[PDB]
Task: inverse folding
């Protein structure tokens, strides 16, 4: 007997400046929605558009592929929730893809001990960018941070790696096991989640 | 020596972009946080009329000489509003120190970037027609209004537009560095 409560578009994020997705949640304290319709228009156009892809981002999502995504242009979007009894509209959301960039974690993190001749031995860390980021043209710029700690230490040690995809750490505790992770952010935007940890045993003769 | 110029230009652009973003956030949180300023920002930027690439493919379609000259026109067009932003704010008896400080550095750093870009154009395209055309900003009376809400809205829009154009110029310069120096193998 109730129309839906007021929905809310609570997040948008772009993993690479080329596509983005947004997510909404149904309001509580209304009836169950049988359909949602997300519509939007853009700065400087009057045309209204519907969400072009309700599938790719999973449940309650709108995914904007490359042909629908641009930078430096405000999207003004809203989602309506409807059932047989009535309908309800979210607040309008103003979104610029420029400001919601958050990459996926770096890939292929690998760690090694290297002990060369009368040069300090070191831990050698290596990784790769997330896939589908276009760094080679300079369209995207990625910055990386490493963290590492032994089990039971109260603090992580953090190392800024800038734009490198390998790094050397010198002051390790001989004999200790370390958990190592890596994360990345665009030049301007949000840090990714940390990658899955890799583990390394530092040998005794360090 | 292209590589030193490009590295310096990109340091300056990335630094300006970051400062403009922090300035806009501080102004937003202090003066506009609760209100419909964002709705009045829509379509308010003096550089909108310019034909600018809006995604990677459009950027890739734009030849380098037009691309460089695009960046230069954008930067030249911001000299006037940045000068008046700093003048207007510095002449207020109780100016926000964190806001004023950023505006003054963006004003001085934008000049240095434009000087680097003029050097880059002379090295890479030594015989272009020296052609000055860029969009005119003329929003000074609105920064000057006695109405506090109209005033803060005009400032909001200028700082929103500055955050956008600085990010954009930084991104275009990073693309061009990769294209010109590295054949798109950064
Ligand atoms: Cl973050
Ligand atoms: Na996406
Ligand atoms: Na959906
Ligand atoms: Na696109």
Result:
């Amino acid at each position: 007997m109730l129309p839906p409560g007021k929905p809310e578009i609570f997040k948008c994020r772009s993993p690479n400046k080329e596509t983005f997705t947004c997510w909404w949640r149904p309001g509580t304290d209304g009836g169950l929605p049988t359909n949602y319709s997300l519509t939007y228009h853009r700065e400087g156009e009057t045309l209204m558009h519907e969400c072009p892809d309700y599938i790719t981002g999973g449940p309650n999502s709108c995914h904007f592929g490359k042909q629908y995504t641009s930078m430096w242009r405000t999207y003004i979007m809203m989602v309506n929730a409807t059932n047989q009894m009535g309908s309800s509209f979210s607040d309008e959301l103003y979104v610029d893809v420029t400001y919601i960039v958050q990459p996926d974690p770096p890939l292929e993190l690998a760690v090694e001990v290297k002990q060369p001749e009368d040069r300090k031995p070191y831990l050698w860390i290596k990784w790769s960018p997330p896939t589908l980021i276009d760094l080679k043209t300079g369209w995207f710029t990625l910055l990386y941070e490493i963290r590492l700690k032994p089990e039971k230490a109260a603090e992580w040690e953090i190392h800024f790696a800038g734009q490198q995809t390998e790094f050397k750490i010198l002051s390790l505790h001989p004999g200790q096991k370390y958990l190592v992770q890596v994360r990345c952010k665009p030049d301007h935007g949000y840090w990714s989640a940390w990658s899955p940890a890799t583990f390394i045993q530092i040998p005794s003769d360090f | 020596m292209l590589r030193d110029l490009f590295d310096r230009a990109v340091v300056l652009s990335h630094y300006i972009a970051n400062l403009s973003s922090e300035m806009f956030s501080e102004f937003d949180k202090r003066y506009t946080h609760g209100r419909g300023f964002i709705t009045k920002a829509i379509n308010s930027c003096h550089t909108s009329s310019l034909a600018t690439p809006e995604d990677k493919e459009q950027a890739q379609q734009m030849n380098q000489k037009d691309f460089l000259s695009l960046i230069v026109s954008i930067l030249r067009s911001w000299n006037e509003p940045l000068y008046h932003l700093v003048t207007e704010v510095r002449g207020m008896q109780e100016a926000p120190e964190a806001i004023l400080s950023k505006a003054v550095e963006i004003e001085e750093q934008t000049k240095r970037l434009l000087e680097r870009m003029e050097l880059i154009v002379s090295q890479v395209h030594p015989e272009t027609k020296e052609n000055e055309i860029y969009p005119v900003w003329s929003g000074l009376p609105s920064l000057q209004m006695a109405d506090e809400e109209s005033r803060l809205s005009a400032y909001y829009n200028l700082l929103h537009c500055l955050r956008r154009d600085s990010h954009k110029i930084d991104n275009y310069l990073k693309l061009l560095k990769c294209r010109i120096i590295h054949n798109n193998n950064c």
In short: Chain A touches chain B through 24 residues (CB under 8 Å). The longest strand of chain A covers residues 177-186.
